[PDB]
Design a protein. Structure first.
Lengths: 604, 109, 41, 604, 604, 41
């Protein structure tokens, strides 16, 4: 049973309506199922432990028995009259609301009390590493004590109550074994209150540490089910939400990104220059679109973000072409009639809006750093919005210069300030971008081995690629973490892949002389580096031309392997290299024993 | 006492440090303001000169301070308070405790 | 380390005590007590 | 009850003082509460499973019953005489210390034993993805077997014991259903020992996966309470500790950062040059402070860190002004009399200490990379300390050049090596920095919408801004993760904000014609992108001029929403887009069924 | 007991063979141990809660009692005949397979049902932050309701069932206290079904929050045992696997990295130029090895990776030396006879392979960005493999230019395209690299204070240094997180170190006048910044010349402290600064009360 | 908010209801139910 206890308000006959939460002057009795007593007992148990320090310091008020907050009522206990009717409990143990209040504020008040002392006990305890993980190692008690008698700073609490803290301590450190009163010798065994827990944390030499290897697994299992690593290369529309894209604002360096390497950025590849004009704040400036191609951020295929083009440390040659100086650098949109990459001359450019200029010309924004005047780090920045560009077939964001007077000097300059580190930040997660279009769902499998070397590094913050990369990255840490894809152990991961290579290379051999019986020693090893190359750089699985990894099978395969692989690790997964791991722990205890030996001499 | 309703801060307010993170819309320095000027061995006017501004910063709309200034008369009580005029100071029970004072007009302005 | 006597069953400076870690019993108390909504009930 | 068992040493009457830990020749009996038997049973259960492999290989020693390590003593069981008095347990089940030792080293020894085999069983099991997540899919057993008879490398253990591993396997993979002996046909149902657990992990088509959606929530709940996301925009002094700043060493590019964009960096904006001198290692060099403003790291407002100015790949024009070559580049402090930004000429600069020079002039540190000789990657580096600058009102760290002989050539150079990538690393977490001052506590709400575009990116490693950014970043991953702030589901997050916008826009309408009744469809949508823009780039909420996000309400609001939102997710939160998610899983099982079909043909 | 139930197939006498899983027409009865009923009850309990909404909307089918899926069989219940023999259970409660199916698909079907409604209830609940964390704060109900009557968008479900959702709600938000029918007033206490859980999550003013502080500890404990932070500075061979290196592809900028600062990169420091030739694709090009030293990636000491040298934004002076234009930039290997750094002239260079050229000369790859033509972002890229360089003592990877015709113009150019951002990605984790050699195991302690300032930042992706950095980094977040290494609390971490400094400085004082009695106030403070400097920048502990941190004791010491420190935190660790933390929470509730006050007026 | 009457023990617009958060009872249902393999059994 569970929930609050109910009782037949109509008396005797208890039906699915003659019940009612048995409330009263104390609040409502909620049932205390077996396991929920484990907690409140485990919590109180950790407080009672500090008994010797509560009396010493006259705080506290006696040991807290959980049997002081409960009661022994009886009735039907469920979550609702209907279902509570199927849990007739007699003399169960319930805790009334007003009690659920004290057991709370008591464990809270006492928790402070101890939390404090417990902190002093520690700066003194750990102040001599009472924990080794291979074999033993003593340190003659006299010295030890006479030593901490020093180190411990005058405001601890282990100097005001030595054997009032010691008695608390003995129950937390199975290192300190108190000398028995009637034989005046230790005990071999150490009996700290955490008897079992402390036994099951020792780094057992057979397998690393059960508490470790156990969690590193349940931890990975969490992720595997959580983010949705499963279904990682699913071939079908998936809401961007399914990718929980967060804290995702990637930055670049356009005016370098080739147009074909990333759809969201077209260029004005035209013969001559395209000097246009525009009255901005009265003054008339001339946008240039200089000698080179001047790659500009396209506006369509640009998920309403927060574009913030930073222009700093980048050269600013106002020294040579004086034409450049005087011009306030500024991010400006450019609506063109004919599609760009077909826009020849000025009459082609519909209009030009200065979405964000920089007050003060190019001769105050400068700063000489050895001849080559740089740009005082400043951030121009628009706030592009999907629909502010409705209809408008062609429009481009360009972080240019806005020259107040074009001249012969700036005839080979080309004032694109795009060489600066632009940082787009998708401000509306629901919508992603792929191959130049804005969508609401991705098709994972499509984005695999479909980008090129740099059609990946040139991805646009929160676009399929960047999403089908953030995803693999989780799955990449589950294998990297739990599975042993980094040793000659032909693990579950590199194993799922090997079976694909076989089934694959086996049918490609079917029909024709079949002169080559499948290899296997070579297949195991080829798939080992395939699974390994993945854990290594999760990204690669997106680039066209990557051995194994990019065939449709793998990944879809890998994950579902790694999947079941985590759901069976056992507990002693740590047996892997638990030999050198062990031998390394003994190595430490031998060096730490060496320490105790000095504590033992210096302070005799 | 419920933490939300009653709070307790240790250390004196005479020291600049104490005023970090203590914001109350109203302060009351009754029975202390006189002892602080004496404890910090400082002039009464000069003392409140540094306290009032702290209460303003502390975010205070109202103030009540049991200052000890002879606003009615510079006349004193034979056994209760002696008004040493060489040095602006009182003597509650002549000796039992000595605390500097201000004048009605100077302290007022 | 001044002698106490009964407050607690052990004296610190008491006769034959012994600091001596054993890889076997990693000291512990109870930190990870579960209280999260679903798990506490 | 819990803890070690005690018994009346004084006999009969137990008075809370009579009781003593019932120790003896076996150690101390510690009680084995109901739940703690669940673990040791669940641990032993996972070992017994491997019974068929223990006999086959003559290891092991029979099935391990947990009832072999316990006993049936009876007495009072608590943590201390006082509280143990309230737990009279009769014939409880306790495990003695020396036993708590075997149940430990047995589960450890056996755990190794199985951990090994269990690894072989796997490279063979996952080596044919026995796990699908939508509908079924078989693969005629003959083929399957005759297939793995191949792939499996000659050193497995699934080839030496086929149906000795198979029997272990059948209990772990409800995929392999053994053919019943007396009807020689499968069973429809599959009965693996993990009957329930395996049932509750299947990706249930109604809602993603209970095991997933459940954890992704408890996981977020952990963080929410842990780091202290709650109280994220609290308006009142908070110890830096409350922000657990760790692994926090940010790097820049000064000599670019404007002085007003980041208080910790002032500049010598003076008319002419300020050539000073200083005997460093005998030789007399001249610090320049050349033509430009030469931005220098201020020393006050500089949390005793580890400044490490790297100067590499950056230009080094010793080719033109020969003056530059011969000068050993070096980070140097500069104490000035009059405050900088008021320091006109040499007589103003008190002294200049070469806190770290680079041995060998500027013509060995070079390296030609196409005409423009660069700087061989080298790291100069001081170790500034709060108090080494006590009293000293003005002092600045400057990574300049130290020219051995100033000339006309270096009259427009300005040797500030600050254009290099400097990396400050706060070496003393307790102290933070804000607006130019060093403090011990932040006031969160103060740092919101108080920085500018770049008064953020120019923050100083472990300063309020960088702390009130590391914090939002956690809270940003709790929403990004748990809450669905990335779909049209007007989630709890974007909902907490909408209620603020209403209450806000509603009172701004009070008093005056109230010609505009609040919108709502427009408010919901405006707050959706507000909560969304946050998850996106957590930082923004610090920059002055960000719609919604920067009003005092939000955040303080958001978090406390997201807060309660996680504490109610239910379990089936995965119902979100659990349709396409499902349809994608069927998509995979259809492709994986396609695989089994080849395994089924190629190897008949 | 646990597992499936068995019964004596041979009847009466139940031996370790006369048993057999009691299967049948329903599947196999698996035992439902005490705790496993807690879950299925806790799951069903959370569904029954939504009873009022199931009837309202005619879905559901009555309350789901867990006692409808189980049974009361009796027999022996274990994991295998052998061990099941020691668990005779009478009238235990087992759930048959076919049932373990419904309790599953029911909780799944119902889970969807509620998951939906439960989402509507929320957008409305959190839409008025029903959760404060200090003191109370009301908001006159009328207003509140009449308010949400607005905000809530027309497609919720809290408008179609107000007090059908309200009744569900009252059990989840102890904020909404329903007015009692027979006294028509609230209740003071609030009785939500989560009575206890909700009591134990409140931010208790004594210590932050038990649910928080508890997890932040168990969380850290997980890591500490997991990754293997323990043994962090172990002095003995450790398989790279023990470091779970994943998602590890670091990028650089060679042609800058000094050869001695990173063994994996030697340079051709020769007097004149070394123009060689090579027929690549018919056309004959000349590799240059120009004027400067031209640092090249060495091939040995290069873990078979995926070298991808990006050349973008970097200068391309085809404007001056016309010689440069026309030459296709390309990454090329260079096998030399005599070891490099001893290779004088052309006859010395055995052969030169163009492992990856860039189609199209240097005058299409350009792009004018203000005079200085840059490189259109493109990625050349080899796939170096350990053994493809077997025997071959000397061979180097060089991303040079391949000039189609060397001239006088390119006599001081030196076409090394290495100034570009190269990104090596280890494609085979098992093998690491150290000091220039490829290995399979590291020796941790060796890599401490053994690298120089930049012999660290110049590390090669997945090399000991980068591994002995990824490791410290975990341990750095465990302390940063759990332990308070960021306040004057002389924590367990900075305490473990202090004891080393003492024992160390104490013996260095032994022998000779011992004129200096150890300090301690100065030692505590010195070790505090030592432990602090570590949490800060984990890396440092690798660099030669770091105070304290780099002595062999520390770290090996630190960790083992931090270790036991986490295994005792208590629960109320949050007591740290739980004063200002509290005062900040009251600060928020005072501001949130201010909000409710407007909701209370505007919508009267 | 239209009156219902019996469907559920409380009317929403019912007499004397009261929204009033208390730092003491942080509202929470059951999200973190443990189901992971080892822990569910
Ligand atoms: C008398 O108090 C002399 C000092 C000896 C003990 C003081 C505290 C240092 C030793 C701690 C013992 C309890 C657990 C560390
Ligand atoms: C009648 O339905 C008028 C609207 C009043 C309540 C509608 C929903 C808003 C209040 C929610 C109450 C239940 C939990 C939020």
């Amino acid at each position: 049973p569970t929930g609050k206890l109910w009782r037949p308000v109509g008396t005797s006959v208890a039906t699915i309506d003659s019940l009612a939460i048995v409330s009263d002057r104390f609040g409502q009795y909620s049932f205390v199922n077996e396991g929920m007593r484990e907690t409140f007992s485990k919590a109180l148990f950790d407080i009672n432990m500090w008994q010797p320090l509560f009396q010493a310091t006259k705080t506290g008020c006696g040991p807290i028995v959980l049997s002081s907050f409960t009661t022994t009522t009886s009735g039907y206990v469920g979550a609702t009259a209907g279902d509570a009717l199927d849990n007739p409990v007699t003399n169960g143990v319930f805790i009334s609301t007003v009690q659920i209040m004290n057991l709370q504020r008591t464990i809270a008040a006492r928790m402070r009390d101890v939390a404090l002392w417990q902190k002093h006990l520690d700066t003194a305890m750990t102040m001599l590493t009472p924990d080794i993980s291979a074999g033993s190692a003593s340190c003659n008690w006299k010295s030890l004590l006479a030593f901490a008698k020093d180190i411990l700073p005058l405001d601890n609490l282990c100097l005001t109550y030595p054997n009032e803290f010691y008695n608390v301590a003995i129950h937390r450190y199975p290192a300190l074994k108190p000398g028995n009163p009637d034989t005046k010798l230790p005990d071999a065994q150490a009996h700290p209150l955490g008897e079992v827990a402390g036994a099951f944390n020792a780094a057992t030499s057979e397998v690393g540490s059960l508490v470790g290897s156990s969690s590193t697994l349940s931890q990975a299992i969490s992720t595997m089910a959580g983010k949705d690593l499963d279904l990682i290369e699913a071939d079908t529309p998936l809401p961007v939400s399914v990718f929980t894209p967060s804290l995702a604002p990637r930055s670049y360096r356009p005016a370098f990104i080739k147009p074909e390497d990333a759809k969201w950025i077209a260029e004005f590849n035209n013969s001559s220059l395209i000097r246009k004009t525009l009255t901005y704040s009265g003054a008339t400036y001339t946008v240039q679109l200089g000698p080179g191609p001047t790659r500009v951020i396209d506006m369509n295929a640009m998920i309403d973000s927060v574009l913030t083009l930073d222009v700093s440390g980048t050269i600013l040659p106002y020294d040579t072409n004086p034409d450049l100086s005087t011009s306030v650098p500024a991010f400006v949109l450019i609506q063109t009639s004919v599609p760009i990459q077909q826009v020849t001359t000025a009459a082609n450019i519909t209009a030009i809006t200065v979405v964000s200029a920089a007050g003060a010309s190019a001769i105050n924004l400068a700063i000489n750093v050895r001849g080559q005047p740089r740009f005082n780090m400043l951030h121009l920045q628009a706030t592009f919005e999907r629909e502010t560009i409705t209809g408008i077939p062609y429009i481009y964001g360009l972080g240019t210069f806005l020259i107040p007077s074009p001249t012969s000097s700036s005839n080979f300059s080309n004032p694109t300030l795009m060489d600066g580190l632009l940082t787009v930040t998708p401000v509306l997660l629901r919508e992603t971008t792929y191959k130049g279009e804005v969508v609401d769902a991705i098709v994972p499998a499509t984005v695999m081995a479909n980008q090129t070397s740099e059609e990946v590094a040139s991805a646009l913050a929160n676009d399929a690629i960047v999403l089908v990369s953030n995803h693999l990255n989780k799955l990449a840490n589950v294998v990297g973490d739990a599975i042993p894809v980094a040793s000659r152990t032909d693990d579950s991961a590199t194993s799922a892949i090997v079976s694909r290579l076989a089934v694959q290379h086996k049918l490609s051999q079917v029909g024709q002389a079949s002169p080559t019986p499948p290899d296997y020693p070579l297949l195991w090893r080829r798939a080992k580096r395939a699974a390994s190359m993945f854990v290594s750089n999760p990204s690669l699985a997106l680039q066209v031309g990557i051995p194994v990894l990019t065939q449709s099978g793998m990944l879809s395969a890998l994950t579902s392997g790694v999947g079941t692989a985590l759901r069976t690790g056992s507990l002693g997964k740590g047996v892997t290299d638990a030999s050198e791991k062990l031998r390394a722990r003994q190595s430490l205890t031998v060096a730490k024993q060496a320490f105790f030996d000095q504590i033992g001499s210096l302070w005799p | 006492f419920d933490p939300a309703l009653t709070a307790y801060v240790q250390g004196d307010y005479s020291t600049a440090a104490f005023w970090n993170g203590i914001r109350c819309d109203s302060a009351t320095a009754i029975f202390t303001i006189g002892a602080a000027a004496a404890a910090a061995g400082t002039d009464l006017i000069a003392f409140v000169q540094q306290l009032i501004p702290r209460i303003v910063a502390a975010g205070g709309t109202r103030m009540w301070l049991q200052l000890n200034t002879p606003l009615y008369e510079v006349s004193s009580l034979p056994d209760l308070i002696e008004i040493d005029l060489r040095d602006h100071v009182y003597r509650f029970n002549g000796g039992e405790r000595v605390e500097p004072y201000a004048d009605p007009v100077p302290l007022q302005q | 380390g001044n002698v106490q006597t009964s407050v607690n069953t052990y004296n610190i400076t008491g006769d034959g005590n012994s600091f001596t870690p054993t890889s076997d019993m990693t000291s512990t108390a109870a930190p990870a007590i579960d209280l999260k909504p679903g798990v506490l009930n």
